[PDB]
Amino acid sequence: GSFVGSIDQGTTSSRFLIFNGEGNPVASHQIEFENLYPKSGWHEQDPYELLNSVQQCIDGAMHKFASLGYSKENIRAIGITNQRETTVVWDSVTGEPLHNAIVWPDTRTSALVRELKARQSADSLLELCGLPLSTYPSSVKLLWLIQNVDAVKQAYEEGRLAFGTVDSWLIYKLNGGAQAERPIHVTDSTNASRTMFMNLRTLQYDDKLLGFFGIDRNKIKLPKIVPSSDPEAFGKVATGALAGVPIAGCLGDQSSALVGQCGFSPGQAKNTYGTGCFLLYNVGTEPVISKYGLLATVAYDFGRGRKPVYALEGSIAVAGAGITFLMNNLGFAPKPSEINALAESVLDNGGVVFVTAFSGLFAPYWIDDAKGTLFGITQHTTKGHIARATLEATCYQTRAILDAMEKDSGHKLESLAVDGGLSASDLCMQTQADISGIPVDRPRMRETTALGAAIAAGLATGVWRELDHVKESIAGGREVFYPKMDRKKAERLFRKWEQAVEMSRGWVR
Amino acid sequence: GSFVGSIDQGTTSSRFLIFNGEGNPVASHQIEFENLYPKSGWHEQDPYELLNSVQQCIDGAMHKFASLGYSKENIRAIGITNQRETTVVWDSVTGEPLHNAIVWPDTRTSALVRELKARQSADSLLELCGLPLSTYPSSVKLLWLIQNVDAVKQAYEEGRLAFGTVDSWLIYKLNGGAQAERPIHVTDSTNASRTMFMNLRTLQYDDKLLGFFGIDRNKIKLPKIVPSSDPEAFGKVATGALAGVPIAGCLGDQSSALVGQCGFSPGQAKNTYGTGCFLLYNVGTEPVISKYGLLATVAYDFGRGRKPVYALEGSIAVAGAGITFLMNNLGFAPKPSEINALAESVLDNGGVVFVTAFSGLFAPYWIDDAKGTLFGITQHTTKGHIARATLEATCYQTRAILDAMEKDSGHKLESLAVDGGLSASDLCMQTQADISGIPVDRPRMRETTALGAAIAAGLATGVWRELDHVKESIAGGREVFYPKMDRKKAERLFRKWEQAVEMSRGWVR
C-alpha cells in the first residue's frame, strides 16, 4: 500500500485527493455543494449533502485513479480534514440526522451568547478550553438546537441524540454508521478543541464546561476524543470504491494546512489567504492562553507515545476583500492579476497607508469604531500607491498577529508558510518577508490542506515513520521569498502602519 | 456715452470687455500670454507683455464692437482690474521697465521672509496693514529686487526708480507714460492694501511699514493712493482705439469679483473657484483684523463722500484640484462633467469624508502635518461616495472659512455669490446651500470679475448713480440654490467633517 487518500470536506466544497509517497496528488475530484441560508445570518447545510459530496468525490477520483492502472489496493489509508465547529446532530441509534448542520459562520446564536457571557461563571472558560465565547464554537450552536428544535429536545432527553463536528459525522457514516460491526463515533483532538467542551490541557472533556452549557454526558452521546493520527481508532471505509481501506488520520482544516506545510516546530507558522486570513502558530507541547484575544488550540495530536502540540490562532477579515474592494468599488482593474500589476507599477507606497478596517479591526487591535481609512494622499498619489498600500495592509496585519503570537508563546517566529488567494502575488509575499524579517514559504503543490490529512494517515500506517521524514519526502517532486529590504526602512513602514491604526480609532459615533 | 469698458489683466490672460447699461458684455477679446519661470518657484512676467496683451485685447474687441456699428463714442469710461501683489519696477523718468515683473505666487523671497519675520518688530505689522507677512505681498518682492538686481539698486538711490502693482503700471502706460501732459502714477485703495506699505485704517501710507522694509519715500517713487472709483484721478487712454476715453475705475481682481456680484452689504460674500478658492467677505466700513489668519483688506473705495468698505479674505488650496485628483490620479472619470455625474449617482456620501489636505490645511485650521485623508470606507463605499465627498470637502472648507469670517466681523453671513470652476456643478452649489444655510447665487453672465471694474467706472461717470441702482440694473437681461436639507442632518455632516479634520492632525513626522 503506497498511496494515501485525503478527504477535504470544506465550507463550500468537498474534494478527495490521492497522493503518492512524495506528496504529489495523482487523482482528485471536487464538488461545490449546496449551502442553505434560511434567513439572513443563518447558515445551514444538509448533513447528507456533505457526506454524499465526499463520497462522490471518492467515486470520481477513483475513476481517474483507475485510469492509470491503480486500484483500491494501492491506497494504504486515508485522512479526513474538515471545516471546523460546524455542528451535526444525529440519532445515536438510527444514524439519521435530526436537523440540518449549523455551519460555523452562523450567527443565529447571537441573541444567546449574550445570556451565557452574562453568566458571571463564563470567563475562566477561556483558560479552560482556549476559546473566547463566540457565535462560532459548536457548544453554543448545539445549545441553540437543544432549545429551539423539538426533535433535538426530544432525542436529547430520550438518551437518543448524538453530536459531532463534521469530522466525526464523516467518520461515523463512512464506517457504516449504526450498521457497522464496530460503530465509530470519534473525534480528533484538534476538532475537539473547537467545541469549548474539551479541556485544552487534558485533551479530554471537562465537566465544568459541559456544566455551564448544561450538557449532560449521559443523555447526549459525545464522540470519544482520539488522536489526530491513530492506526485503528477511526476504523475503515465500509462501502464504495475504498471499501476496507482504513481511515488513519483526522484533522481540523486550518490545523491540517499547518501540518501540510510541515510547520512542526515552534515558531513555524502558516497563513491561508482567502477573503481574509487564517493564521496558525505552533507553540510546542504546552498550551498557551493569549493576552491578545487569539485562540488557543491543538495543532495536531499524532499519539504513538508523543505529546500533543498546541497552537495559537488569529484571523484577518480583509485580505482578498481589499483586492476585491479596489476592483469592484474603485474600478482600478478588472482582475486580481492586474490589481497586482498596478501595485508593482510604482517603486513604493508613496507614503500611503490604508487601514482596511471595513468592519473594524480584530486580533490583536480589537478596534470596533474604525472604518477603512486612507492616509498619506497627495496630488502625487497614484492608483499604484493605493494598490500597493492595500496589499501592504494585509502584510501589516499578518505581522501584527505574528508579533502578538510571539509575545504569547515566548518562541521566536522562524518561518511563515502561505497558501491560497493573495499568497499568489509575488509582491505581497516579498513584502511579508521584508516586513516580518523571516523567509516566507509558498509551495507550488496547490493542495496543502488535503496534504495534512494524508500526512497524519501516512504516519499512523508507516508510509512515513518520523516527521523529519515528512518534510524531506514532500520536497522531492518562485517558492521562497527572502527579506531584501533593510530593517531600518522595514520598521518605518510598520510604525507608519501603527500610527495609522492609532489614528483610525474612534471614527464612528 | 452708454457703454462701459473693462480691462481684466489676469495671472495667465488678459481680456477687455464692453458692457451695456444692463451689464451684459457685447464685445470681448482674450489673450493667453507668456509666463516665465526662470528657476523652480520663480514666477516672472515681462511688463510689456502685460501691457501689450491688454492693448491688443482692446484692439480686437473694438474690431468686433465696430462690427455692430458702435464706435469709441459709445464708451463713456473704462475700468481696470488686475491680478494683485504682482510687482512692477520702472524708471520714474523714462517709463522703461527696470526688470521683469515678479508675479504674486513667486517664492524667491522665501529665504528673506525669514529674516524679516525674524526682526521682532514684525508682528504689529498685522494690525497696521491687515496682512500676515508672506512671500505674497509686493513689499517683500520689491525688497528682494532692490537687493539682488543692480539696475534696481542703482535706479532706487538715484531718485529714479518707480514702483507699482499691475493696476498702476497699466494706468501709467495707458495715459501715455512719461510723455503724457498729466502723468498718472496712481493706485486704488484695494490694490494699495495688498502691498503692506499702506495703513488699513488710513488708506494712506504708514511710515512704520515703509520703515521696517527700509523703503525711503523720497528715492522710491510711489503711486498716489486714490479711490477705486474716481472721475478723474486715473486720466484717460492716450493712444489706440479708445483714445480720449477716461479711465474711471480700478480694482484688485478678487475685490472686483465681489463688486461684480453686488455684495455691497456686510455678510454678503463671494467665492471664486479654480484649482482652489478665493473667498471675499464684506465687513462694512471699519477694518477688522482676524484672529484666524484671514487677511484684512479693502473691499472697495468708491469715494464721492462715501467711506471705504473693508473685507476679510481666505483661500483654499484644493477645490478644482480635488476633481483633477479623482480624474488624473484615480481614473474615476475623464472630464469634470462626469466626476460630477459620479457624485450624483448616489444618494449621499455613504459616510465618507475626504480631508483633502494634500499640502496640509490653511485658513482657519492651519494644519501643516496632515496629508489627504479618507475616512468612512467600507465594502459598500463606491466611486460615487468618494466623488461626492470630494465635492463636499470644498463646501466644508468654504463653510469653515465663512464661519471664521463671521466670528471676526460680528456680521451674520447673508449670501454667498459664486463664479468659476467648481461653481458650475449643480450638486456642489446645492451642497453649499445645505451646509451653510444661506442662499448661494450663481450668475449666468460669465465675466463677473471684469464686471466689477466696469461698475466702478460707471459710478464715477454716472452710468449708474447709486449702488442700489447697480444690482437692479444688472439683473435685467439654474442661478440661485436654496438650502433643502434639514439643519439637523446639515450639522451632523459638518461635525463629521470637523472630527475628520481633527483626526488628520499629526500624520507626517
Residue numbers in the entry:
A (entry chain A), B (entry chain A): 65 to 541, 551 to 582
Study authors write:
Here, we report the first structure of glycerol kinase from the thermophilic filamentous fungus Chaetomium thermophilum (CtGK). Glycerol kinase (EC 2.7.1.30) catalyzes the transfer of phosphate moiety from ATP to glycerol to form glycerol 3-phosphate (G3P). Overall, the CtGK polypeptide chain can be divided into two distinct domains classified by Pfam as FGGY_N (residues 65–325) and FGGY_C (residues 331–583) connected by a flexible region. A similar case is found in CtGK, which forms extended dimers via the interaction between the C-terminal domains with a prominent contribution from hydrophobic residues (Phe422, Gly436, Phe389, Leu394, Thr437, Phe439, Gly440, Ile441, Thr437, Thr445, Leu438, Ile450, Trp580).
Subsequently, by replacing the cryoprotectant solution with 20–25% glycerol, we were able to solve the enzyme-substrate complex with a clear electron density that could be attributed to the bound glycerol moiety. In total, three different crystal structures were obtained in the presence of glycerol, constituting 13 polypeptide chains. Generally, the same extent of the chain could be modeled as in the apo structures, i.e., for residues 65–583 with an approximate 9aa gap between H18 and B18. The substrate is bound in an evolutionarily conserved cleft within the N-terminal domain that opens towards the C-terminal domain. The glycerol molecule is coordinated by polar interactions with side chains of Glu149, Arg 148, Asp317, Gln318, and additionally with Arg148 main-chain amide. The carbon chain of glycerol packs against hydrophobic Trp168 and Phe342. A similar mode of binding was described previously for P. falciparum GK, where Phe271 and Tyr135 undergo shift upon substrate or cofactor binding. However, the movement of equivalent residues (Phe342 and Tyr200) was not observed in either of the presented CtGK complexes. Of note, we solved and refined five CtGK structures, and each of them belongs to a different space group, despite crystals having grown in the same buffer condition. We observed that in the absence of nucleotide, CtGK adopts open conformation, which upon nucleotide binding closes up.
